[PDB]
Amino acid sequence: SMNPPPPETSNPNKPKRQTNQLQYLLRVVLKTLWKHQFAWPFQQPVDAVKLNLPDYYKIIKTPMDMGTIKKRLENNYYWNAQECIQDFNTMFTNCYIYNKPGDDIVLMAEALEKLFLQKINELPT
Ligand SMILES: COCc1nc2cnc3cc(-c4c(C)noc4C)c(OC[C@H]4CCNC4)cc3c2n1[C@H](C)c1ccccc1
Numbered sequence: 001s002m003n004p005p006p007p008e009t010s011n012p013n014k015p016k017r018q019t020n021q022l023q024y025l026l027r028v029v030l031k032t033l034w035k036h037q038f039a040w041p042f043q044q045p046v047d048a049v050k051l052n053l054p055d056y057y058k059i060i061k062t063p064m065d066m067g068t069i070k071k072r073l074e075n076n077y078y079w080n081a082q083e084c085i086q087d088f089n090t091m092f093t094n095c096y097i098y099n100k101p102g103d104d105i106v107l108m109a110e111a112l113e114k115l116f117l118q119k120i121n122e123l124p125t
Pocket of ligand 1: 095
């Protein structure tokens with residue numbers, strides 16, 4: 001009936017680094033997806049209270065969104081680039097679990113995922 005607290009976006013107890021791959025994930029990958037026509041349902045956690053989706057957090061136990069990913073990159077939350085790529089993959093997979101194949105929101109997610117896969121295939125050394 002209530003929303004869960006959003007995912008953690010900062011942890012001072014975890015070591016921090018800047019890498020070319022982490023910089024690419026913020027400046028190219030997230031930037032590209034964030035400005036997309038279909039980004040907006042994915043820019044913040046699913047508000048299941050406001051959207052009247054009482055079953056959402058009854059089946060989605062690893063929620064993820066691009067608002068969370070943006071803050072995690074900004075706060076140096078990720079040590080390895082694959083940690084960030086996994087969060088994008090979790091966000092897409094969650095959409096493909098809760099929603100029937102061919103649904104409006106699934107088609108929007110698929111359009112974003114096509115662009116995501118192109119950019120990850122060009123991830124720098
Ligand atoms: C008219 O209301 C406007 C509106 N704002 C938002 C914000 N976030 C939404 C997130 C989702 C969503 C995602 C992603 N992954 O799982 C879910 C569930 C969303 O899904 C709609 C499906 C659930 C049941 N059938 C469609 C909608 C969000 C949303 N919306 C509306 C409800 C909306 C509906 C369809 C497509 C885009 C936006």
